[PDB]
Amino acid sequence: SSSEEEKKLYARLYESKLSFYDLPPQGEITLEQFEIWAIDRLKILLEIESCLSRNKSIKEIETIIKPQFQKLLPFNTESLEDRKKDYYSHFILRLCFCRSKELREKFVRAETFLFKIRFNMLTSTDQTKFVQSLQFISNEEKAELSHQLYQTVSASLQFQLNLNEEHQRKQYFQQEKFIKLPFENVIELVGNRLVFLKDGYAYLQQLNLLSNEFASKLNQELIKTYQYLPRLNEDDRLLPILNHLSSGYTDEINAQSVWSEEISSNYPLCIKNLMEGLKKNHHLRYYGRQQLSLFLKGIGLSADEALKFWSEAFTMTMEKFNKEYRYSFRHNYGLEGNRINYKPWDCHTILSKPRPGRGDYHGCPFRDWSHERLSAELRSMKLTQAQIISVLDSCQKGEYTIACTKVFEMTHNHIAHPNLYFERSRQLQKKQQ
Amino acid sequence: QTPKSSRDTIPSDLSSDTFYHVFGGNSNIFESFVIQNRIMGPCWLDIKGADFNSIRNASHCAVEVSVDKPQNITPTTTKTMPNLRCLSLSIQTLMNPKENKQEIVSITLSAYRNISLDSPIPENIKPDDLCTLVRPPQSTSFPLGLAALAKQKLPGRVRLFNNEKAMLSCFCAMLKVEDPDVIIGHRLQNVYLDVLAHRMHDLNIPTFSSIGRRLRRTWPEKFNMNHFFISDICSGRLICDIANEMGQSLTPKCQSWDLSEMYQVTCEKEHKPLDIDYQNPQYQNDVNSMTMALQENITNCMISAEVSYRIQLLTLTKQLTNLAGNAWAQTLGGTRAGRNEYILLHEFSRNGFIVPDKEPEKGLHKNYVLVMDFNSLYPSIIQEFNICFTTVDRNKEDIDELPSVPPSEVDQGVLPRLLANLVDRRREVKKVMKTETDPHKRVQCDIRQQALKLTANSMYGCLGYVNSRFYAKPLAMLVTNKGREILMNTRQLAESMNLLVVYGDTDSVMIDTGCDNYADAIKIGLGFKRLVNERYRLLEIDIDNVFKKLLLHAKKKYAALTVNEVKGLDMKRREFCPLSRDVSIHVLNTILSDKDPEEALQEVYDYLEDIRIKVETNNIRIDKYKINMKLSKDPKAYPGGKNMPAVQVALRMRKAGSVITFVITKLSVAERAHALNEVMIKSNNLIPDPQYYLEKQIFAPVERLLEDVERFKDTVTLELSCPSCDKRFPFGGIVSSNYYRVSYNGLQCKHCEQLFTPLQLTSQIEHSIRAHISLYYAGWLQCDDSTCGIVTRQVSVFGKRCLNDGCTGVMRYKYSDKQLYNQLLYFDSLFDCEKNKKQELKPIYLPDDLDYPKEQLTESSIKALTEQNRELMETGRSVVQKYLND
Amino acid sequence: KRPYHPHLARSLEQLKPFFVSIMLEEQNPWEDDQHAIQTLLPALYDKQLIDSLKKYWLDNPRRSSKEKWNDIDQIATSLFKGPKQDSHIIKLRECKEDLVLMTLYPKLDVEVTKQTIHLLKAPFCIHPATGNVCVPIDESFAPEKAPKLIDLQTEMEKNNDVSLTALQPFINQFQAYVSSLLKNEL
Amino acid sequence: NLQEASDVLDDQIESFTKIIQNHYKLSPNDFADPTIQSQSEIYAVGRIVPDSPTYDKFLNPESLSLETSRMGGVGRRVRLDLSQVNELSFFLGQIVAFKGKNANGDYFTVNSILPLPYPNSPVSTSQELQEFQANLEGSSLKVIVTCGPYFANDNFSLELLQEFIDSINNEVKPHVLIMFGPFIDITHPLIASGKLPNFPQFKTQPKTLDELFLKLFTPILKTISPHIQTVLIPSTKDAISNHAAYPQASLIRKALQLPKRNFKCMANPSSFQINEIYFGCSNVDTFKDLKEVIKGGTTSSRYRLDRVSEHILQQRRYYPIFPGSIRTHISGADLDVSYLGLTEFVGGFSPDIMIIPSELQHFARVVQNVVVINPGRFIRATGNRGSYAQITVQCPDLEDGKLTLVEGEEPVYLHNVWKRARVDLIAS
């Protein structure tokens, strides 16, 4: 495809500033664009989901999501590369989240919510030309039937957009366009008295209809892509990326100052467990050593202070230590072998490691600990019973990381990296001081 | 049988004005014989009107009868069967380099004439007869004293022959005399029967048909048809091959299915194979080596027969055949297609129907892991949702269109009726178990239940296989999506009761129980089984294998400690010295011990420190350092002869096949090797090399055993040349250096102060991009397995298979599109004005580098020099973008 | 469900004038106190008002349906006082609307409409128990106006031509209907 | 990609299996797995690979394999036993065929080789040839071929180029001038070391290599007389080109600022027509890279250029060597194997005249009734006279009988260019 044909075809695909992602994207991308676009949209989705799990209002969610809209996946722009980004990233995520029903449900709700925000963020004229691409009613016709439309749609607005105040509902109604169409295409809404009818025409609360049709169509396409995926597994460059974004859904600092309350009060649960175990057993095995060493390296423990900290913690013989552990503890600091400055471990990589048995303390406690031990810990962390129940709820679903964010915020006032936990805690502590 | 045109069939598309389609044009005579007479596999046959005088000298059987019409033969209800005469066969071959022909040297015949499937086979049956034939592999005479000495140490009888011709003549005669009923041996079907038939064809023995039961004097004129001809030749005597597809289907635990591995896995006994090669000259005058060879052959024959008794191959195939109604041989030496074909043929034909014309969580898992069986997934779906050809409404114009499941008002079909019938028979068999006291009848119930479950599980091969007689893509897609949904809901249930899906597919899923006691893991697995059966009434999964400790890398590449041993990692013992094997084995023993794995790990650690000290001080026996390697070709013609040490030692001595034993001493790694017996001699002043054996032989295996700034951390720097004085120096953007200075008039070398005009810089940038791209298109591939690690540019047609023989690594293009793309991205960032101003650039020099810059630029100087040098930077950036945008 | 649908409110407004004249006077079903307790009192929303009306009607038996209808409002005004009285008046008016709909709204047989394969009795078919002709309905139609087969036979015994029965006007209405249907089809 | 590369290297083997089966009228039952033990002689098609994944640079008939495709042998490579073949010639990347037996289980002896059939030459109808007769106006067809590099390693003088252009404009006057890169080679010493000096004759100096080409080649390529059609076919070593992997996308004529009147930028490789002639043009030095393995006196006594021309014809690909050879990094053949479809004989038509520039001495030969011309480099590194190619073709004539009629219901005519064309290697 010549880039001119691609430009004309995309202009046709983007006659409206929002889309139903009907036609598969055509063209070539370079795998960085694949990956960066996928991760940008994926972070938007995870932000949306985190806002939802906190039951914030849709206006608040719009306000929070405006800035990273201007950052990662810009909208309301005439750029061809931004629109290429939106299409190709959404279709890559359809590839990613088609594998499991729980994932496809998550993608459907997330993309449904994102679509709702996007549709609210366009001006009324662009909303009209999007609906056209279903005849919007004139302002005279809207004013003539204003009372009956308001009576029909007030309950739906109150129960779907949470506009408990009559004045807010009236303001929203004044700006809301309506669609005139046969009732035969809106029978499901008709049976529930959700749509106002005159002379065989239905006056659609339209955004809920467009959202539901988008959700259903999206779900059907998701099932189609899940059917065709075993023809996509043949290419090597794609599957690791898809697996990573699919599963991703799951000196002041010195050898001494780490063990103090001022510093370890900031550590997440994984680090607290790791140092509890180190202090009691005077030893951690391979995985625990690696993850705690790299966490310390992230928080700012230099190679020398880490070597002193590890030697003093192993209360065994320095000879043994020097033969066996110093080489590893330097290599994790990038002073041996290929000198690759090894990266600290994030919750995805921590959770990808095998489960702890007897004597192991590594991994994430929110997944490894029985609910009684977590309850005792959180009761020690002055968390109230409702707070503990919510944490156990998020933990039961398989949303360990969300529950980690919850305990963090609840004990201080979306975190999937222990150093990020520590650093946000430190930023709050310095601010408090 | 017709007087004229017996060989011409009737095409289905025969032109006619009264009809327009013909079925049964290409029916098989056995197929119609079995379908019409309602035969179902091997059973007692009542045959009337048998002619006892018409057949003269037509077979190798003693009893010869004939019938005049098929209606004379009817099936009886008798469930007992006579004792089977099994014969165990094993062959040692010799590849002739001249004609590339595999030649037969020794035969080991072990017979078991009273093998009864009605009763449990008692372990380690001794054969009723043992025979072992052998012919000279090189000359026409054997080493002196072979006969008496083999009588002294080998069991059974050994028969010596001057050549392979009288060899095979006596083999055929002994087969005719024995008249066994089932032939048993390992990898017979696809290698040994083929080579045996070929070498028989070559030698022109009169009695070749004795391998089968039909007497023929001449070969087929046309002798892939080789398989059909051989299988027809051996007709009458079932070929019971243990490594064939079905024999592999009854041992999921193995990884090579070599005879020793199968023996260890199924009989829990150890056997160390002797690598045999009759090309070696020692087998023509050294009697002991030949007799060790024959002993290896005899031990293989007994091992094969015993394992085939132990996995219950014959009984399971018999019951699968009685279930699907096909021939027994089509079950033994085939795939699921034959059984899934014949049972559907029978089921539809007896109901007045017209049939068609003919991902892992790799690492070390400490918790108990269970192998839980989803073999009965697809039959469970088919029965539950009544998915059948006569129930589901589908579009036959477009086969990819996914159909909907029939509403409950629709009635059941034929195939799901078979599935429910099979499930019910398994349940009644289990009810009989729950009361049965006699162990014999109880193991009979075991076998019947297992065959029923195997048929139910293999039922999906009727319709899921593409070339299958009843292929149906819409139904296959429906069943498959439903199974995928059920597998998901199993994952969700496992999470809902606090287990992990360690690895899983439509066949089997292994689950992290999270408990370290056998009873606790069994209870967790049974609870999960109850949970899944509650959510899916017909899906009855079981526990197949219990893993206390699991070193997992794939479905079929792992090490673990099973509950009722290493598989997949011990093949390479030649390359590794005695010390390395002792180290690996002691490390494994301590790690897999019942001690606390922080004290077992410290014990490993003390062992490693002590062994490092011992190697460095060289107080270890020189015997422990020896490395053996066999020479495939002559040492003078070895390509790359300077890199493997055996060539160095052998040429210092100065044939192929001679074993060189060597020690890396303390110049090239290949060159430092010395003769092992030379290194023992202390007066030669030769000591082993601590570094080599400590890095490559001891660190490498245990490394497997014990298993914007970030992006560019592995990217390389841009080396320019100064045009005037020829001074080469890296370029790091607008930063400090001892070699280059960015002035207000452009980039300036510091050795001669001569400026770089934009051409002299972009030409060199683009020369480096072109060098990198030439390197990336050179196509260097590597092996991910650290013990192989080879460097290669060849690409095997399967792209991701390493070419090291049987090595299980995953090949990857060394200069990946990831490294290459990132290199070009760092090349871009070297010329990004915003990055240069923000001092975000990757550093060229380390603080210990002798060329670390003495003078550090200030922020204001960098910003001003970037603003004065924007045009140069932009042209340099576009030079790179002209490839990044490609 | 509230607020009422346009169609539902229109049906209620069409049905309101006929409610009194039919139920409260012509039928008068609630003059029986047991019938009133069985059919009227359930449809109210408040237990206190229900019990009070039950007691008042047991104290004053056989009060007419109009009288009980007025007593509902009188006792409801007597009981519900304070700033919350308007909510109770609104709910009582909603209950009365729900009840007039319950008593006069069409009660369609659901099964015959749903499927295209349903069978319904053809027009003019004879009723085996009454012999009445299933004649088309105009605005003035009544059950007594439907002709009987014995009456049609008696009429035909005097004149042997179908155009001379009372059945012929119904056939003429049918012919007008079919003519209109044919022209709209065209 | 590697899955795509493995796919294409499978399709080579399978399509060549199909072509062999159609040509020798064999049934696919003959085609079978060569790496797994057998009892009878079988047929087999596969690629050539070193019998090692890491090999010594030099190969012999005792260190070869025959890689198998995905369905023939599920990706397994089989060593070669070549002791019963006395005359043979292989090379790395060459999809071949064997008839043999692998009873040794470890060695595939070849009792007989199937030579791949050479593709059918182009044909044309009488009407088209008469149009070409009218176009030529009786006089012959004249085409000049040049191949770079066009200036010496120690200077930037294109005086030899201006001489050559004056020559073709005023004495030779050829219908079509086809010229090949490297135009501005990226491996040039003065251009790699950064020794590119100030040019007094350019009013404004160049700043990149693209400006170098626009100011050094465009002003001199514009002087070619518009009556002379010029075709540009790039190389992988053109710094002007942004596609560094064979096959190479066509240069952009507008960017080169060249006139539309007489310039056509074409992709590498390129097969096209000029009047009735089918030309094969590809710019990766196959004659140098193809390192054969020879057994037999008859084959060794034959011209190496004849053997490699036959190889390029049979292998239905302009560059049949895999892995792509490397100059050690400075440069190399630079194959992109994901697209080894595009480097095949377009339509399966063996081109009449095949032009492959090579650093070797200029030659032009007819091998298997196909004129293969290799013109050499326009200027040697020292600056002495290089070479270029002259192609003169007699006008077609249906009466002269040099075009052979092809029997059939539709009368079409084989071009006999090896009968009609004279080629002269005139040092530039």
Ligand code: SF4
């Ligand atoms: S959620 Fe992440 S940071 Fe928090 S305890 Fe678990 S592993 Fe540690």
